[PDB]
Design an enzyme around this catalytic site. Structure first.
Site, PDB file in Angstrom:
ATOM      1  N   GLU A 128      -6.543  15.898  23.793  1.00 37.14           N
ATOM      2  CA  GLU A 128      -7.574  16.613  23.039  1.00 37.14           C
ATOM      3  C   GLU A 128      -7.107  17.264  21.741  1.00 37.14           C
ATOM      4  O   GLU A 128      -7.226  18.478  21.568  1.00 37.14           O
ATOM      5  CB  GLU A 128      -8.205  17.666  23.960  1.00 37.14           C
ATOM      6  CG  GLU A 128      -8.534  17.094  25.348  1.00 37.14           C
ATOM      7  CD  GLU A 128      -9.179  18.099  26.296  1.00 37.14           C
ATOM      8  OE1 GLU A 128      -9.167  19.315  26.009  1.00 37.14           O
ATOM      9  OE2 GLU A 128      -9.690  17.660  27.347  1.00 37.14           O
ATOM     10  N   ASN A 169      -4.967  10.870  24.883  1.00 36.67           N
ATOM     11  CA  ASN A 169      -6.136  11.132  25.726  1.00 36.67           C
ATOM     12  C   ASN A 169      -7.082  12.153  25.093  1.00 36.67           C
ATOM     13  O   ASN A 169      -6.633  13.135  24.506  1.00 36.67           O
ATOM     14  CB  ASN A 169      -5.636  11.660  27.079  1.00 36.67           C
ATOM     15  CG  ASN A 169      -6.672  11.558  28.181  1.00 36.67           C
ATOM     16  OD1 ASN A 169      -7.210  10.488  28.440  1.00 36.67           O
ATOM     17  ND2 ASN A 169      -6.937  12.676  28.856  1.00 36.67           N
ATOM     18  N   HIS A 205     -15.979  11.962  30.433  1.00 38.51           N
ATOM     19  CA  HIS A 205     -16.720  12.995  31.153  1.00 38.51           C
ATOM     20  C   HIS A 205     -18.115  12.817  30.553  1.00 38.51           C
ATOM     21  O   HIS A 205     -18.412  13.346  29.483  1.00 38.51           O
ATOM     22  CB  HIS A 205     -16.169  14.381  30.825  1.00 38.51           C
ATOM     23  CG  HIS A 205     -14.864  14.681  31.492  1.00 38.51           C
ATOM     24  ND1 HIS A 205     -14.727  14.747  32.863  1.00 38.51           N
ATOM     25  CD2 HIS A 205     -13.636  14.932  30.979  1.00 38.51           C
ATOM     26  CE1 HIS A 205     -13.471  15.025  33.164  1.00 38.51           C
ATOM     27  NE2 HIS A 205     -12.787  15.142  32.039  1.00 38.51           N
ATOM     28  N   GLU A 233     -10.716  10.129  33.115  1.00 36.94           N
ATOM     29  CA  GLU A 233     -11.228  11.259  33.890  1.00 36.94           C
ATOM     30  C   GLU A 233     -12.716  11.097  34.120  1.00 36.94           C
ATOM     31  O   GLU A 233     -13.490  12.045  33.983  1.00 36.94           O
ATOM     32  CB  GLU A 233     -10.963  12.563  33.133  1.00 36.94           C
ATOM     33  CG  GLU A 233      -9.503  12.779  32.754  1.00 36.94           C
ATOM     34  CD  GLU A 233      -9.288  14.004  31.876  1.00 36.94           C
ATOM     35  OE1 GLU A 233     -10.085  14.967  31.965  1.00 36.94           O
ATOM     36  OE2 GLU A 233      -8.306  14.010  31.103  1.00 36.94           O
ATOM     37  N   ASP A 235     -16.444  10.888  35.229  1.00 36.75           N
ATOM     38  CA  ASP A 235     -17.447  11.584  36.025  1.00 36.75           C
ATOM     39  C   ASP A 235     -18.716  11.629  35.182  1.00 36.75           C
ATOM     40  O   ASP A 235     -18.662  11.652  33.949  1.00 36.75           O
ATOM     41  CB  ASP A 235     -17.028  12.988  36.521  1.00 36.75           C
ATOM     42  CG  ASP A 235     -16.559  13.919  35.424  1.00 36.75           C
ATOM     43  OD1 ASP A 235     -16.996  13.799  34.260  1.00 36.75           O
ATOM     44  OD2 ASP A 235     -15.750  14.812  35.759  1.00 36.75           O
TER      45      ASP A 235
END
Ligand SMILES: [Zn+2]
Ligand SMILES: [Zn+2]
Ligand SMILES: [Zn+2]
Ligand SMILES: [Zn+2]
Ligand SMILES: [Zn+2]
Length: 313
Positions: A128, A169, A205, A233, A235
């Protein structure tokens, strides 16, 4: 034993995994599924700076080791997460004199990468580093070291472990837009300057009903740059409470995401940020949102699971 998500994924040359955390290991039902359904595992928290280097120059891989060993025992590959990040950073890091930070970041990276050398398939080296508009996040690293900190982090990692895949990432870089363009330019820049980088991790996400339609084109353009891509990650949260319609939309979304990865040869795998709503980080960060995973709080498989398996075929 019906084909697990991991087995279905492996049959297509990819992995399907889940992140996990030490506090969850006591849950026997949770661990039994974690070890048999997936082919890959990501250390969810204990590989982060606040845990691995709580005091300057004193490292601690205890907690992380527990999860890595567990994955190895089940024959599951492991992704390291994460070396350089503005969050979950011990307080001493901010006190490091500006001129010393680069040396400290390199050292932190060298010790952690060296300790796990030969045991991990990937490392999320920098996490990030960009804002939504594509500019650099003004973290302690960006402010005190400058724009080159990212490149320096990747070089340090490569120097400590030649074979592990090095990934950048970030979240909200699934669709084509300002943020992903910035990552795209950085990667292109790294390739031209000889800076080591093997892949881009799209955290993924997502929000149910709002999956970027340009997802697959975005995955493809990165693959064409010469780097692998992974959904790290995954979801898909929804506004609570659950309903059949929301669950159905979520299922459709999961299917679309999986299909997207399957059509691009360099999309190496998918990792869900844990697999059951019981331990999802979503509720604690997004007030009023949740039910973002394929398994609910009682370990019942949702329509989402059916969609994922169908996409994997
Ligand atoms: Zn300890
Ligand atoms: Zn061990
Ligand atoms: Zn050292
Ligand atoms: Zn653009
Ligand atoms: Zn239920």
């Amino acid at each position: 034993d019906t084909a697990t998500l991991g087995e279905l994924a492996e049959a297509k040359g990819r992995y399907f995994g889940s992140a996990t955390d030490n506090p969850e290991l006591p849950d026997t039902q949770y661990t039994q599924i974690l070890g048999s359904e997936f082919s890959q595992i990501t250390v969810g928290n204990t590989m982060k700076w606040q845990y691995t280097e709580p005091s300057r120059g004193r490292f601690d891989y205890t907690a992380a080791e527990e999860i890595v060993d567990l994955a190895e025992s089940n024959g599951q590959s492991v992704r390291g997460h994460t070396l350089v990040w503005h969050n979950q950073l011990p307080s001493w890091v901010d006190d490091v004199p500006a001129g010393e930070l680069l040396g400290v970041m390199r050292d932190h990276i060298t010790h952690e990468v060296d300790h796990f050398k030969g045991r991990l398939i990937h490392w999320d080296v920098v996490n990030e580093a960009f804002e939504e508009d594509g500019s650099r996040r003004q973290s302690v690293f960006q402010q005190k070291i400058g724009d080159s900190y990212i490149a320096e982090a990747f070089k340090a990692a490569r120097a400590a472990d030649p074979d592990v895949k090095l990934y950048y990432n970030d979240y909200n870089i699934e669709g084509i837009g300002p943020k992903s363009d910035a990552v795209y330019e950085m990667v292109k820049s790294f390739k031209a300057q000889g800076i080591p980088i093997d892949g881009v991790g799209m955290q993924a996400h997502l929000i149910a009903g709002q999956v970027p339609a340009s997802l697959q084109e975005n995955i493809r353009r990165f693959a064409d740059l010469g780097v692998d891509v992974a959904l790290t990650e995954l979801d898909i949260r929804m506004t609570l409470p659950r309903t059949a319609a929301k669950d159905a939309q979520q299922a459709t979304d999961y299917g679309a995401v999986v299909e997207a990865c399957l059509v691009v040869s360099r999309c190496v795998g998918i990792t869900v940020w844990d697999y059951t709503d019981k331990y999802s980080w979503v509720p604690s960060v997004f007030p009023g949102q949740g039910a973002a995973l394929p398994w609910d709080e009682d370990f019942a498989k949702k329509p989402a699971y059916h969609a994922i398996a169908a996409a994997l075929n």
